[PDB]
């Protein structure tokens, strides 16, 4: 895939999948307990480009073992909470040789990250 993945997770939710072409970002609750993600954020940095931030609804729950996939506006997916949220305000997550995805809780703390690097 020419992309090496490096992942860190400190909470119950991990950044499960990051699309190489910037179509979606998929997060999973790898715990046996549901996690509330109200006002949580996704930070995406693609090389030197300005940071892209997505904000979760003020009230939102990801149950144990479940998946929430934040889709881009250009992905053409169907918006359907709580499993599929579409970022209509952003065409795509972006592309490049340096893609960093970080999950941030409501308090501004980084709880997970997954970085993909290509040669």
């Amino acid at each position: 895939s020419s992309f090496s993945q490096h992942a860190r997770t400190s909470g119950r939710v991990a950044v499960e999948e990051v699309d190489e072409e910037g179509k979606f970002v998929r997060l999973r609750n790898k715990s046996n307990e549901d996690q509330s993600m109200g006002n949580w954020q996704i930070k995406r940095q693609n090389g030197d480009d300005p940071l892209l931030t997505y904000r979760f609804p003020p009230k939102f729950t990801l149950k144990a073992g479940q998946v929430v996939t934040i889709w881009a506006a250009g992905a053409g997916a169907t918006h359907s909470p709580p499993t599929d949220l579409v970022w209509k305000a952003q065409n795509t997550w972006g592309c490049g040789n340096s893609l960093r995805t970080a999950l941030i809780n409501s308090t501004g703390e980084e709880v997970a990250m997954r970085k993909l690097v290509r040669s």
Partner: protein, 88 residues
């Protein structure tokens, strides 16, 4: 319990923060550490790791390095320990 500087440092990976970003490290202590050679946050983190996360040894080395007191050394050790627990 902790100052705002502590929370700011513990929140995110150190990356390239200067020594002045450490909780419990001010202008005087930062300048002294930079004079000693400890010119970046990661250097202090590595020195903390070498002493195997021991509180006493880390605080003693800090006291002999820059002349920090009980409060500043305690804040530095706490911030580094929590950062390791969060990211390392």
């Amino acid at each position: 319990t902790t100052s705002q500087k502590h929370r700011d440092f513990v929140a995110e990976p150190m990356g390239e923060k200067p020594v002045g970003s450490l909780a419990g490290i001010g202008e005087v202590l930062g300048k002294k550490l930079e004079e000693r050679g400890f010119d970046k946050a990661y250097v202090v983190l590595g020195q903390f790791l070498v002493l195997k996360k021991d509180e006493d040894l880390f605080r003693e080395w800090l006291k002999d390095t820059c002349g920090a007191n009980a409060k500043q050394s305690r804040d530095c050790f706490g911030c580094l320990r929590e950062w390791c627990d969060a990211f390392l």
